[PDB]
Amino acid sequence: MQNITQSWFVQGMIKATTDAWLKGWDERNGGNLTLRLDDADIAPYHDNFHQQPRYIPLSQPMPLLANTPFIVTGSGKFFRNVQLDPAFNLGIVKVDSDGAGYHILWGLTNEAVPTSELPAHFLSHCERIKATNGKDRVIMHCHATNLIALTYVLENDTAVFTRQLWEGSTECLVVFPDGVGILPWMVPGTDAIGQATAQEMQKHSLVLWPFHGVFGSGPTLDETFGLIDTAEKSAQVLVKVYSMGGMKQTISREELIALGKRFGVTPLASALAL
Template identity: 55%
Template sequence: MTIEDMKFIQNFKRMTNDAWLKGWHERNGGNITYRLTKEEVSAIKEFINEDSEYNSIGVTVKNLANEYFLVTGSGKFIRNMTVCLGENAGIIKIDEKGENYKVVWGLSNNARPTSELPSHLMSHSIKVEKTNGCHRVIMHSHTTNVIALTFVLPLEGKVFTRELWEMATECPVVFPSGIGVVPWMVPGGAAIAEATGELMKDHDVVIWAHHGMFCSGETLDLTFGLMDTVEKSAEILVKVLSMGGKKQTIVSENFRDLAKDFNVSISEDYLV
C-alpha cells in the first residue's frame, strides 16, 4: 500500500475532481485543507519526512499545535490533483507553538502550500474550538453564481442568508447558521484570515466578495455538499432575478415550521 491508497487521500482526490467538474476551480483557483485524524497520522508514519524545515505561517494557531493537514499547493491546479497528487498537494505539520509549518509529504519540486494557508488555518483554529474538534475541512472555491451575486446584493450576511434560504427548501436545514460576508480584501494575508475567522465563529459558510466562498465541515463529503447547496441556491437566485424577480416565496412562518419539524435552530435575525 502507498500513501495514495489511503481512504482519506482517495476521498480527497474524488472531491477535487468533482469540484473541478463543477467549474469552481479555473486555472489555480481555490484551495482545500483537511486536518488528519490521529489514526490517519499513525497510518502514514512510514511515508512522511519529519526532518524538513519549518516555515512561518503568518498567524498563530496554538490549538493546532502538532496537527497534520493535507493541503493543496500554491499555484497548483485542482484539476491535476488526481493526475499527480504529490506534485500538487502535500501534508504539513504545525509546530508546538502553532506559528510554523513544515512539509512532511508531497509538494515536490519545492512547491509550497496554498498562499491562503493563513485563512485556512485561522478558520480551522476557530472551528476546532467551536465544534470540539469535529470540523476537519476548509474548502475555498470560486463558485460562479455566488460571486455574481456579490455584485448586485448588499454585502451583508443577513441579506445573503435570507435570499439564498428562499431559493430552496433544504437550505436552512443544510446551513441553519446562515452566511457571513467579507467585503473585498487582498487574499493571502493575516487581515483577511482574521476577518474570515471572526465570521467562522458563527457560520460554516463565509463569502469573500467578488472572489468566492469558504466552507467548513466535518468531512470532505459534507463540506463539498454544503458548498454545492449554497452555489445551487445562488444559481436559482440568479435565474429568478433574470426573470424579473420573485412573485412568491417562502415566508418567515414557513421557515419556523421547517425548523421545528427538522429540529434545527434558526436565528430570528434572519426571519424578520
C-alpha cells in the first residue's frame, strides 16, 4: 500500500491549506479545516496508524459523530507549513462509539492536538449532516481578507450582507442561495461560538464572524474552498466598488429572481425582499 501521505484526503488537505495560504487568508495559525471521512477511506492505511493512539475527550458529547473518522488541522499549526510536514500539521481522529472523545489514529505528532476551534467544526458538521442528509463533509474556517473588511462597514445583518454579496458577482446567488449568516462578535475557541456557528449552519452554508473571518460547509474540499473563494471574490469586488464611492448600478431584485428561476434555486427570502 502507498503511504497514507499519498492518499487523496491527505493530498487534498495539503492542497486546500496551501492554496488558502497563497490567498492571504491564513497568516500565522489563522484558519482551520476538517474533513469527514468514511471507514473505507482510512481502513487500507491502517498499518500507518499510531501503535498506541492518543485519546482526547471532546468538549461535549457528540453521539451523532460516534465511530466517525476525520482529517483535521492541528492547533497552532501554520497552513503555510502543511505541505512541508503533513503528519506534524494534520491528523486523523476517530470519534469513539459513545461520541465522548476521539483517538488520534495518524499524525498530530510531537504532542500536537486538533484545532482549538474543534467545537465549531464538529458541532457544525453535526448540523450540516442533518441539514444535507449526510451530503456535506467539510468545514473550513479562514481569515478571508475582504469579507473581514466588509464586517466593519456593512450592517452586520444576514439579509443585508447576503444581498450585497449576491450583488457583487452574478454567480453568488447560485452558489449560495441560502445566503450568509452573520453572528455577533464572540470570543474565539469557545463552545458558545461553536454552537452559535452550528445553529447558523442549519440555515446557511456560510457563516461570518465579524472582525475575524468566515466558516463554510460543503460536500468536498474543492466545493467548500470554492464556496468561500466565491464569497470572498464578491467581497473583493465590493470593497473596490465602495472605495470608488459606491454602486451607481447593480444586480436588481428582478434579475436575482430570474437568476434563481433559471438555476432552480430558492433565494433566501429576507435578502431578496430588500
